[PDB]
Design a protein around this ligand. Structure first.
Ligand SMILES: Cc1ccc(-c2cccc(S(N)(=O)=O)c2-c2nn[nH]n2)cc1
Ligand SMILES: [Zn+2]
Ligand SMILES: [Zn+2]
Length: 241
């Protein structure tokens, strides 16, 4: 098995498929995990989501690479056998957008914050084909997120990056914080190279206020946790201000 240097380990309830791991979180929600192997350091896990909405599937975040992302699509084909309607990617970094070309080759409509699409070239990413825009309180403008089904997109403010977005899964108790949120036992806020340290704490708390009844918080680099992930992330961020 893959024992990542960074990220959660494989545990009971996990399915290894090719180079990836899949974990069912709810009847209609699965977490995908892919790994970036760093020489002399080891693997770094990154998580995203797969949501079934009736006769179609929705994806949140790519894997690190196009091949890993094509493996996500193969898992969906084998395990669900329904078409992927769209994907939402949560900021312009490799772990979240590294596999855009695989989604495009498959003919899947891709969405990201307009700012993620604008930053994508400098970040070495391929932009999504559609841009999401947001209100002054962070909620997505609904005309920019057509037919998103249960995905409720929220821009919490600058934090891990200035473009980071989050997604609540309506009809469930799950919300996805991406790379903004760290687990309740995390020791750091991860890579702060592109972060807004002044606004981070407020952005983390805004995510919690946007999805006040979500009890399962999913994030990029740890296993799903309680709402203490939000509070602990904000407390660590209070130290940067
Ligand atoms: C403990 C830890 C976890 C993850 C990383 C990481 C590794 C590679 C790439 C990124 S990103 N999205 O490019 O900035 C990150 C990261 N840091 N915080 N969120 N994601 C580093 C340390
Ligand atoms: Zn990032
Ligand atoms: Zn990350």
């Amino acid at each position: 098995e893959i024992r990542p240097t960074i990220g959660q380990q494989m545990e009971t309830g996990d399915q290894r498929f090719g180079d990836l791991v899949f974990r069912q979180l709810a009847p209609n929600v699965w977490q995908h995990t892919s790994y970036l192997d760093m020489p002399g350091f080891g693997a770094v896990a990154s998580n995203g989501l797969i949501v079934r909405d009736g006769g179609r599937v929705l994806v949140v975040d790519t894997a690190w690479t196009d091949d890993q992302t094509a493996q996500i699509l193969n898992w969906i084909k084998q395990e669900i056998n329904l078409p992927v309607a769209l994907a939402v990617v949560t900021h312009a970094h490799q772990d979240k957008m590294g596999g855009m070309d695989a989604l495009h080759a498959a003919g899947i409509a891709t969405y990201a914050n307009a700012l993620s699409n604008q930053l994508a070239p400098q970040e070495g990413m391929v932009a999504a084909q559609h841009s999401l825009t947001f209100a002054a309180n962070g909620w997505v403008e609904p005309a920019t997120a057509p037919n998103f089904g249960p995905l409720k997109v929220f821009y919490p403010g600058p934090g891990h990056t200035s473009d980071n977005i989050t997604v609540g899964i309506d009809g469930t108790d799950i919300a996805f914080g991406g790379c903004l949120i760290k687990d309740s036992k995390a020791k750091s806020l991860g890579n702060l190279g592109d972060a807004d340290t002044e606004h981070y704490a407020a952005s983390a708390r805004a995510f919690g206020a946007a999805f006040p009844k979500a009890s399962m918080i999913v994030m990029s680099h740890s296993a799903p946790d309680s709402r203490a992930a939000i509070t602990h992330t904000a407390r660590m961020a209070d130290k940067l201000r």
